[PDB]
Structures are given as structure tokens and as C-alpha cells.
Amino acid sequence: ALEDSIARFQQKLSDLGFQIEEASWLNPVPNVWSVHIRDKECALCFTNGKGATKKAALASALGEYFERLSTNYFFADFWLGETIANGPFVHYPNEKWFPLTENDDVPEGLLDDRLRAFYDPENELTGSMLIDLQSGNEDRGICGLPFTRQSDNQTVYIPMNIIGNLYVSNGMSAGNTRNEARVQGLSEVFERYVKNRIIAESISLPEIPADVLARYPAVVEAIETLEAEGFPIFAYDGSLGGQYPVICVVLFNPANGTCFASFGAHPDFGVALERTVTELFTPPTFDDEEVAEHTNLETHFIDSSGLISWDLFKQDADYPFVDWNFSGTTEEEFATLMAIFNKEDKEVYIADYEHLGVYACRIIVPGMSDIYPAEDLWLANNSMGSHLRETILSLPGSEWEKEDYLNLIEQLDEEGFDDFTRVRELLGLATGSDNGWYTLRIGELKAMLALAGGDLEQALVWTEWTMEFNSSVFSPERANYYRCLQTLLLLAQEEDRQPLQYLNAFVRMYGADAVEAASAAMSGEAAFYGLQPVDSDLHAFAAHQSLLKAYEKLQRAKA
Amino acid sequence: TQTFIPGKDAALEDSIARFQQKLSDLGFQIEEASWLNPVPNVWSVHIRDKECALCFTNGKGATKKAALASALGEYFERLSTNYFFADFWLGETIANGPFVHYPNEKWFPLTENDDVPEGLLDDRLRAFYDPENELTGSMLIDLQSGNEDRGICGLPFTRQSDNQTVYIPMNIIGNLYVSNGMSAGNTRNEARVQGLSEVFERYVKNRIIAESISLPEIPADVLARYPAVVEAIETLEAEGFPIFAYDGSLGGQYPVICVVLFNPANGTCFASFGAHPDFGVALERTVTELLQTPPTFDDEEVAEHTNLETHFIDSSGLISWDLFKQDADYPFVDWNFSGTTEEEFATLMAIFNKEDKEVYIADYEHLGVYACRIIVPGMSDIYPAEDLWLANNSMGSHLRETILSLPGSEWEKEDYLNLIEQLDEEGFDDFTRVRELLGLATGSDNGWYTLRIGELKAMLALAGGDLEQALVWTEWTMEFNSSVFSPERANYYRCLQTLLLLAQEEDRQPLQYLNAFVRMYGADAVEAASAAMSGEAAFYGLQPVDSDLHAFAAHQSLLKAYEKLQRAKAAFW
Ligand SMILES: Nc1ncnc2c1ncn2[C@@H]1O[C@H](COP(=O)(O)CP(=O)(O)OP(=O)(O)O)[C@@H](O)[C@H]1O
Ligand SMILES: Nc1ncnc2c1ncn2[C@@H]1O[C@H](COP(=O)(O)CP(=O)(O)OP(=O)(O)O)[C@@H](O)[C@H]1O
Ligand SMILES: [Mg+2]
Ligand SMILES: [Mg+2]
Ligand SMILES: [Mg+2]
Ligand SMILES: [Mg+2]
Ligand SMILES: [Mg+2]
Ligand SMILES: [Mg+2]
């Protein structure tokens, strides 16, 4: 019962030491709700609930709260600092650390044989590329988490690095029962796997007949409202000829000429239908190749503003409609779904968490659950920067030689980092919104270095870059600083002109504090404007401290 | 009550009462739209013709009445000179009427080898506008008439050294001088002094700017003389806007003040300029105009003519950082050229004589208020004479009838495709608004209002059934216009674009997508885009246009206004 689920979850969250607060409701059309819930003491811990009734949505918001604390997902994009990294356990007590080997292969106790073949077919994957982000603890080695391989009920250790880079928040769930949660999570796997096929393969799906939709009047109502509100809707059978329990529903916005495709899965057709609808841009396209691109599907996952083929909407479907149904008790539904995975010759790997007093699972199904492709462990690995962290956080206040600064630029180039990459994302820093690190990108950091190493020609290049691409999100203060610095750098290039002449004017336009700071920057003295120096427990960031305080509550719960 | 401000020859309250009355008598319903009093001692007002949206002015002054009198004075300035109608073709009836511009105008038929007819211009002007002697006569056809057969309309101007009449082609006046050096006033001389000062304002400005000059600050004890301005500046300064006040005389030569505002919030500056024989009036004029881009070290981009051309339209142009250098290139001069409007006129004219610059004035009294128009080639120019070849506002006059015929036209497909190539060969810019190129007051509620050359090329490619070109320009169209199209029209273009892209997919079956298209774009939009593709009805949203522009109600209101001026002119002669 929704009301039990809510009462229980609220209570348990409170007991755990979390002050949870309800930010903002919404009831856009009939039979559709959502709510935003937040940790009153950590801005970064928050969820979004959705359902066809108000309570359904609150229960969803709270359930996702336990899903994300149980799995540690809130903290998944952040380094947890040197103390936690060197503590008894980082992720879970039952985690397992595999030191790096002398030739840097992937240690033997990790993964299994099928996984090794899938993630690393060429056998070129090194061990040091699998260091989890949270610890960044190369000396301690590769953290691996336990997962029950389902065919033979044996434990398998999967590196947290792999889990987090390729599966992210996919196939996680929390529930009232072990099986309820697993059915939700396994369905979440079908949702996203089928979706990526329907989309990438530019499939035309078959409409759901009107007399079938009629069974679910509360959804029909939500659609008639959207349709009368000026938004054409398409409801589709995403089963691909009865195979998978997936509904797809697409909204058109004629005002902008764009479409928005939602997907949803559950063993019961009707639940799946509603799930897809409650979950409601770019126009459709005939670009067979741009739709299929991994970066398109990767977008669709983050937010659903991705490219959909016009082929989806073709009159003639590639599969017939099937009035499917896989329903029953959560226990039966779990077996029915698992049956499908067995039919596909796809090993399922589950991991159970009960340490917060609510059951929560995390489900990997390599070859289906993947959101990102394994090549990304080489090309787009979220701990690629872990080894520069200490160097970079030292820079504010640092007084190295000018060559050292200019080399770090060349290193960033040689290591192939993207200029647009946010530094706070690359190092796993919860900086909070009120300082320079919050908007600092690689390109800006290059400007800063060129200044500290006294190469004013490069400095200008990246200062221009910086403004071209950041100034719209800088604070007034900071944007002004950059305008001023830019002027002075341009003046430096004028060898005919006499800096003193312009000094009064500059002070009037930019303000004295800004001019004094931009000059310090140019003299290589204080190049790293607005960046405070950062200790290796991130005391410097109060945001990050609030993150760690939250994580302490989970560590204690784990013991 | 009677308020006599410096340099005017009549109390504000009289000037207002007179002007309002005279406007009414002329048959104009004038209405006051919106006042403003942003800082102390600075006002402005917007006045509008209740029956023509395009006829409107903006008044500015240091008191409320000063501003209203300004607004009204600029109203007579712009009716007297015909400037409201200067960007529009006036249709075939007016073009072939007794007189188009003024009764005393003069028409010079084109010659057999197409030289510029002999009664036009004089010798110094010919040397200035056309040093290479390559200017042809057919390039000088005024826009308003577009009447090549009737020839080059030329307006009379009293050359001032020897008091002789000189005929200047309306085309030249309008392309290079525009609204510069026009004025209206309470007296002949008041108006002329305002207008001649307007000339110095803009000439000196263009030197100060282009030559990246550092001006000398106006001393504080000098500013002190004009507390009402000082108050306006302190307010702007405390409001967060640094101000710089400058002597723009260039060492006492010219009666020009320059005042620059900084906006630290966006790191930009705004330079205002102003001229009047009396220092104090000039100061206030410069300040009130601050409220009716960042600086740069680019010596070359500041001087570029396109920069100074912007400054005139806009004041959002590039200023050199050099303006603000501590050390000035000229010393401050506590200048003064003042006296009675009669004396001030001579004093100013003295300066032009010193410069060896002929002044050409033209007087208008046919609306019951004196108004002048002053050309001073080599100083009054806003645009350079090279623009009579490259950027001539009647370059398109000869395609007008062809283009306005297109909606409803049923020519051969080759004819449509050629007109594209012609538009390319004649070197028109794709971004150019067609309604500006033909002089059409279309009003905001139809396809012509936003129609650019690039879109027209799309429309022609569709009518001439070249769907590959049609796509190129339909994409172009949306990339650069869709943000200003009406919902309806933007949607039509989204649909047309999809269908043109589908036409390129040789693997795909149009019928499959048909239901989906009808759902996204709507049936009307799909039916229209298909007609367009079949070359049947390509010119979407463009109604056909008769050669008196009855099709456009906006333009009709423009002509109804101009009738009132014609009758007034007839009366006077
Ligand atoms: N009574 C209840 N109602 C709804 N969800 C509940 C619930 N009890 C537990 N939950 C859990 O709360 C989580 C909320 O997610 P849901 O509302 O069911 C859609 P989701 O696809 O997981 O959201 P996502 O797109 O953000 O991933 C799920 O893991 C679900 O198992
Ligand atoms: N009594 C009066 N008070 C103020 N302006 C008057 C006036 N009588 C006539 N005018 C006229 O008002 C018209 C507009 O001039 P002003 O607005 O005061 C400066 P401007 O140089 O025309 O600015 P602008 O060219 O940027 O519009 C001029 O033709 C001016 O001579
Ligand atoms: Mg979920
Ligand atoms: Mg979902
Ligand atoms: Mg279909
Ligand atoms: Mg004027
Ligand atoms: Mg002015
Ligand atoms: Mg100066």
C-alpha cells in the first residue's frame, strides 16, 4: 500500500539521520504527478518521484531516495577525499581490493571469463585504468564490488570503475520486497535496451489499438488532455513482436516542430503503458547514421532530448502489434523476466543492499544493461584525471617555476583532455556555486597556466576562448574580471601604447579590485583567479563537506 | 508662461502651441505615446501619427516642454524634407504625377550614352561624387518615383558662396546624406544654426573616432556653470555609470562637446556628441542624447566606414581606448561662438569658409514652419560616394514589377530559375530584405514583411522545380529567419523543409510518412508545402501586389499621409 510505503520510508530515512524535505509538486495533466524531494543538509542529494496519483509520486520519490543511497549513486561523480579513501572500507564493507600487478594486467580474482571477453576482447585493458573515482587510491588498488551471478548463484567481483562508467544509474531499484525491486530494475533494463534498438535501428513500431488503450481510461484521459492541449500523441507496442515488455509513447510539439519519445517497461502491459506516459527537444530526422551514433543514445539516457528517426512514425510497422502480458506476482514476474534473459543467452548479475532497512538491488546484464560502450574505459573513463588532482588543487598559492606551468598545459594536450571538460567533474569536486572552480573548464585552466608561466600570447588565446564559452554562466564579478584581464592582455600586445595612459579609464570601467587582480594575474603572481587552494579532504569546499557528512551517515549504517 | 531656453528664438510654450495647431490644420492627428524622465534634467517623448504608424518622431530636452517642442520640431523637419517617405517607393500614380518630391523639383532625362546630364550638380560636386567620371545617369534614379522614363529627379539647393541654385539628384541626397543636416525652427536662422551645428557634430565625431583622438576633459569649475547638467551626470554616476565629459573642439576650432558613458555591468561604452555655438547648449545637447560595444585598440576597425555608419544609425559602434588616455592631443579650450541666431549663422558659415567647403542649403516653408536641409560635401556625408555604385538604395528599382508579379504568376520553369542567376549576377546580398530593396511598407502581417533574398531564391527554385537548390535556401531561410516568422509561417517552413529532405531520401516511401506529417504540421501546412514543391503555389504567404500597393494597407496609410503634403505644397506654389 502506497501509504505504508511512504510512512515506512519517511521513518527509516529519519532514523538514518536524514532531514528530507518536499520541494515542488506538479499535476500537469489528469492522472500524472511528480514531486522533487531534497536533503535539507546536502544540496546534491535529491530525487524526483512520478506516478499517476499524488501518493504514487511521493512513494516513487522516496523509493528512488533509497535506491540512490543504497547504491551510493549520489556520491558516484565525486572523489570522497583522502581520509575516506584510506579508511576501513570506501564503498561497502564486503568490497574487495585487488592490488595492481607488475605488468599491469587486470588481476585474476576480478570479473569472470564472459565479462573479460565482453569488456576487453583484445585483452589490452590495463589494471591502472580501473581505479575507482571515489577513492582514487592506486596504491590500495582496484576496488571491486560483489555481484551474485544468477545462473550459478556464485559471487563475482566487478570493479567499481567499470560499474560506474558503463552502467551508471541503470538497472538500480529499491522496493517494498526483494522481488518487487528486482522486477522494477530488470524491467528498467528492458526499457533502455529495447529503446536503444528501436532508436538506433530506426524501427517503425505498431500503434496500440484504440480498444486496447480503452482498458486503461486513466491513461486515455491523460492523453486526450495532452492532445486537446495541442500535443499530438503516438502510443506504440515496443515489444518487437511480443518479445519484450516495452511500451513506447511519443509526443509531438507542433509549435517547435519537435518530438519527445518516452519508453517504459513492466511485465504488466497496463503498468508499462502508464509508466511510459507519466514519464512525459529535437525534431525527427532521416539521418540513419546520426540517430544510431552512441552519443545520441547516451543523450537519450541523460535527458530524452535526442534524435528520433522519422521511420518510427511510418504507417507500416516492422513488427505486428501484440497484446502482450507477462504479469503475475512479483515472484512469478521475476522468473518470467529472467526467462527472457536466459533465452537471450545473457548472464544477469545482481547485487543486493539491505543496509538502510529497505531492499535495493543493482543489476548488470552485460550486452544489454550497458549505457556506455566498453571502449569508453579507454577513451572516456571518469577517473582519467584522478592522477592530476593533487597537482591541480595545489595550483592556487603554488610558486613553481614558469616552465612547470607551461608544461602542465602541454601535458593536458598530450593526455588528450577536452578543452570544454569541466575541471570540477574531471576531479570529482563538489565545489558549490559560489567560487571559481564551479565553472572552471580546461580551456580556462590553460589560460590560468599560461599566465602563471608568463606566456601572454597563449594566455590571450584561452582568455578569449574562456569568455566566448563561459561568460554567460560566470557571476557578474567574475565575468567582469575576465573582461578586464582580456583588455590588459590585448594592451600588452600593443607595443606602441603606454599602459599608464589607459589606467584611469580601466579603473572606471572595471573597478579597482578587478584591475589590481588582473594585473597580479598577468605578472604571474596570482594567476588562478577566484580559485581558493584545496586541501585533500576538500575542507575548502563547504558543499563537499556537506556531501561527506551525508556519506558518513551511510558508512555508519553499513557497520 | 514663457520659457526661453538658450539659442532658441521663441518661448517653448509658443513653439508648442504653434506647431500643434499647424499640424492639425495640415490634417495630421498627432498623439503623444510615451514620456520618460530617466535622470534629473533629461526628458524625452515619442510622438506618432494616429493614422500612419511609419510617421513618428522622438523629442529630447532638459525640461518636459523642451522635449515636446523638440519632438514637434523634428516632426516638421521630417515632413518638410519628406524624410518619412525616403525609404519607400510611392507607387505608380505619384511617380507619374505633376510633381513627386516638390513643385520646384526638376527632371533631367537620361542621355544616349548615359552620362550624368549637364544641368545637374555643379563642377566641385561632380569631382567629389565621381572623381573617375564613371558615374552613369541611370544609377541616379530616385527611389520614390523609380521613374526611369521621366529621368533623374533633382532638387534645388542654394549654393551659399555665390547664392546660385544647384540641382542635386534626389538619389544622391538620400543615399549619402540621409537625415543629416536637416532642421526645422522658429526662425530661418534658428533652424540653420541647429542644422549646421548637426553637421559639425557628425563631422568632428567621425574624426575624433576614426583618427582615435584623445580629447581633453572639461574642467570641473567649467561644468559648474551648468548645474542642471552636473546634476544629470552625478545621478548617472551614482546610478553606477561612469561618465567622461570632453571638449570636442579640437583646440577651439569647432563647437563640439563629447560625452562618454561607461556601463561596467557589460564592459561597454557609449559615446555621445553634440554641437552648438554656445558651449553650454552643446554640453546639454550631448548629455540629453545619452538617453533619448566595448572600446578597442583596433586602430583600423574603428576607422572603417562601416563603423562610423553604425554610429550614425545607432551609437553602438567601436570607440578607441585612446579617447580615454590621460594625455589629450589638444588642450581644453573654454570656447564660445554664441550670439543671436543671425550672428551664429555667420560665425558658423565663417568656419566652413575657412575650411574651403561649399555649403548648399535648401529651404522649405510649405508647411508653415521653416525647415532647411544642408549638404556640405566633404563634411555632411554619412555614407561615402562609392556607395552610389555598391550600396545604392534604388539598385533594385528595376526588378520591382517583376518580383511583385510572382505571386499568381505562371511563367515557364526556366524563367524562374534565371531570375535566381540574375539576382546572383547583379550581386544582391542574400540577407537583404526584399521589402527594403523595393521600398515596400508591407506592414507586419504577411510574408513580404520578413522576405529576404535567400528566401526568395528558395521560392523561385520551387516554382522552377529545382528541388536541390530549393532545399539549400529553405534551410538558409530557417537558419536565419525562423526566429521572426509568425508561428504559422515558421511551421510551414519546418514542414516544407522536411518534405524537401524526404524528396532526397530515394530509399524512402513518401506515403509512409504522410500521416505523421499531417499530425506534426497540420493538414493545411502539408497541402501548401506540397503545392509549393509541385511548383504550383511556390510563393507562400506572398499576396500579389498592384503597382499602387493597394495590397498593403500599411503602404496605403503612408500614401494617405503623403497626399496631405502634396496638397500643402501645391497650395504654397
Ligand atoms: N510504492 C512505490 N511506488 C513507486 N515506486 C516505488 C514504491 N516503492 C518503491 N519504489 C521504488 O522507487 C523507485 C522510483 O522510480 P520509478 O517511479 O518507479 C521510475 P524510474 O524509471 O526508476 O525513474 P528514472 O527514470 O528516474 O530511473 C524505483 O526503484 C521503485 O522500485
Ligand atoms: N523651441 C524648440 N525647442 C527645442 N527644439 C526645437 C524648438 N524649435 C524647433 N526645434 C527643433 O527640434 C528638432 C530636433 O532637434 P533636437 O531633437 O532638439 C537635436 P537633433 O540633432 O535633431 O537630434 P537627432 O538628430 O539625433 O534627433 C530640430 O529640427 C530643432 O531645430
Ligand atoms: Mg530507477
Ligand atoms: Mg523510467
Ligand atoms: Mg509506425
Ligand atoms: Mg536632426
Ligand atoms: Mg543630435
Ligand atoms: Mg582623454
Domain count across chain A? 4
Domain annotation covers residue B565: no
Same domain, residue pair A336 and A219: yes
Range A36-42, long-range pairs (CB < 8 A, 24+ positions): A36/A61, A37/A61, A37/A62, A37/A65, A39/A550, A41/A546, A41/A549, A41/A550, A42/A546, A42/A547, A42/A549, A42/A550
A174 lines ligand 1 (CB under 6 A): yes
Mutate which: B483, B500, B520, B521, vs A, most A CBs within 10 A: B520
Ligand 2: residue of B194, B272, B278, B285 to mutate (most ligand atoms within 8 A of CB) is B194
Angle at A56 between CA A55 and CA A59, to 5 degrees: 80
Separation between Cα atoms, residue B537 and residue B459, nearest integer Å: 9
Backbone Cα Rg of chain A: 26
Same domain, residue pair A147 and A255: no
Domain annotation covers residue B550: no
Q: Do the beta carbons of residue A547 and residue A75 sit within 8 Å?
A: yes
What residues contact residue A535 under an 8 Å CB cut-off, 6+ apart?
none
Give Cα separations from A216 to A52, A57, A211, A269 (angstroms). 12, 19, 10, 10
Same domain, residue pair B130 and B22: no
Same domain, residue pair A122 and A42: no
H/E element, B258: strand B256-263
What residues contact residue B534 under an 8 Å CB cut-off, 6+ apart?
none
A47 lines ligand 1 (CB under 6 A): no
Separation between Cα atoms, residue B164 and residue B78, nearest integer Å: 25
Give Cα separations from B395 to B163, B170, B389, B426, B546 (angstroms). 34, 14, 9, 9, 20
Q: Which conformational region is residue A120 in: left (phi greater than 0), alpha (psi within -120 to 50 degrees), or beta?
A: beta
Separation between Cα atoms, residue A298 and residue B337, nearest integer Å: 73
Separation between Cα atoms, residue A50 and residue A56, nearest integer Å: 7
What is the Cβ-side half-sphere exposure of residue B412, based on CA atoms within 13 angstroms? 3
Same domain, residue pair A302 and A321: yes
Domain annotation covers residue A546: no
Separation between Cα atoms, residue A550 and residue A430, nearest integer Å: 13
Bridge partners, B45 (sequence order): B35, B59
3-state DSSP assignment of residue A357? coil
How far is CA A159 from its chain centroid?
A: 18
- CB-based neighbours (< 5 A) of ligand 5, an ion: A 204, 314, 317
Domain annotation covers residue B557: no
Experimentally, the structure was elucidated by X-ray
Task: Tell me which ligand sits closest to the C-alpha of residue A316.
Answer: 5
Ligand 1 atom closest to A275 (CA): 19
Task: Tell me which ligand sits closest to the C-alpha of residue B212.
Answer: 8
Separation between Cα atoms, residue A450 and residue A402, nearest integer Å: 9
Bridge partners, B56 (sequence order): B48
Same domain, residue pair A100 and A155: yes
Bridge partners, B246 (sequence order): B217, B258
Same domain, residue pair B527 and B422: yes
H/E element, A101: none
Same domain, residue pair A329 and A181: yes
Domain boundary among B368, B393, B418: B393
CB distance B262–A316 less than 8 Å?
no
Task: Give the cell for residue A160.
Answer: 567499481
Q: Do the beta carbons of residue A27 and residue A48 sit within 8 Å?
A: no
In B371-440, alpha helices (H): 387-390, 400-405, 413-425, 434-438
Please name which of A51, A135, A152, A36 lies closest in space to residue A95, comparing C-alpha atoms. Answer: A135
Domain limits for position B75: 1-89
Which A residues in the span 303-322 are in contact with B, Cβ-Cβ below 8 Å? 310-311, 313-316
Domain boundary among B344, B375, B393: B393
- Full DSSP string of A246-298: EEEEEEEETTTTEEEEEEEE-SSHHHHHHHHHHT--B--B--HHHHHSHHHHH
Same domain, residue pair A223 and A285: yes
Separation between Cα atoms, residue A34 and residue A20, nearest integer Å: 16
What residues contact residue B51 under an 8 Å CB cut-off, 6+ apart?
B28, B29, B557, B560, B561
Which A residues in the span 202-231 are in contact with B, Cβ-Cβ below 8 Å? 204
Q: What are the phi and psi torsion angles at A351 (to 5°)?
A: -140, 125
CB atoms within 10 A of CB B284: 26
Please name which of B99, B96, B100, B28 lies closest in space to residue B57, comparing C-alpha atoms. Answer: B28
Give Cα separations from B507 to A286, B467, B504, B512, B571 (angstroms). 11, 17, 9, 12, 73
A472 interfacial to chain B (CB closer than 8 Å) = no
Domain annotation covers residue A544: no
Q: Which amino acid is at A429?
A: L
Chain A neighbors of B520, CB-CB under 8 A? 232, 252, 254, 257, 259
Domain boundary among B72, B89, B106: B89
Separation between Cα atoms, residue B503 and residue B488, nearest integer Å: 23
Q: Which amino acid is at A112?
A: D
Separation between Cα atoms, residue A130 and residue A4, nearest integer Å: 42
Question: Looking up cell 559648474, which residue turns up?
Answer: B224
Same domain, residue pair B68 and B16: yes
In chain A, the largest separation of any two C-alpha atoms, in whole Å, equals: 84
Same domain, residue pair B311 and B424: no
Nearest chain A residue (CA) to B296 = A487
Q: Which conformational region is residue A153 in: left (phi greater than 0), alpha (psi within -120 to 50 degrees), or beta?
A: left
In B177-289, alpha helices (H): 188-210, 220-223, 227-238, 279-288
Task: Give the cell for residue B330.
Answer: 589638444
Measured in Å, residue B353 CA sits from the centre of ligand 6 at: 23
Angle at A326 between CA A324 and CA A329, to 5 degrees: 150
Q: What are the phi and psi torsion angles at B539 (to 5°)?
A: -90, 65
Q: Do the beta carbons of residue B192 and residue B373 sit within 8 Å?
A: no
What is the Cβ-side half-sphere exposure of residue B572, based on CA atoms within 13 angstroms? 19
Domain annotation covers residue A131: yes
Q: Do the beta carbons of residue B23 and residue B72 sit within 8 Å?
A: yes
Question: Looking up cell 584510506, which residue turns up?
Answer: A86
What is the Cβ-side half-sphere exposure of residue A67, based on CA atoms within 13 angstroms? 28
H/E element, A414: helix A402-414
| Mode of pairing for the β-strands spanning B256-263 and B243-247 | antiparallel
Separation between Cα atoms, residue B531 and residue A137, nearest integer Å: 67
What residues contact residue B215 under an 8 Å CB cut-off, 6+ apart?
B208, B246, B247, B248, B258, B323, B328, B329, B330
Measured in Å, residue B492 CA sits from the centre of ligand 5 at: 23
Separation between Cα atoms, residue B356 and residue B379, nearest integer Å: 11
Q: Do the beta carbons of residue A185 and residue A361 sit within 8 Å?
A: yes
Q: Do the beta carbons of residue A268 and residue A187 sit within 8 Å?
A: no
Q: Do the beta carbons of residue A204 and residue A313 sit within 8 Å?
A: yes
Domain annotation covers residue B240: yes
Q: Do the beta carbons of residue A283 and residue B494 sit within 8 Å?
A: yes
Domain annotation covers residue A552: no
Nearest chain A residue (CA) to B261 = A509
Give Cα separations from A316 to A226, A246, A357, B297, B511 (angstroms). 25, 19, 50, 64, 10
A310, A500, A501: residue with CB nearest B513? A310
Same domain, residue pair A73 and A104: no
What residues contact residue B37 under an 8 Å CB cut-off, 6+ apart?
B43, B64
Question: Looking up cell 504514487, which residue turns up?
Answer: A56
Chain B neighbors of A487, CB-CB under 8 A? 294, 321
Separation between Cα atoms, residue A264 and residue A276, nearest integer Å: 4
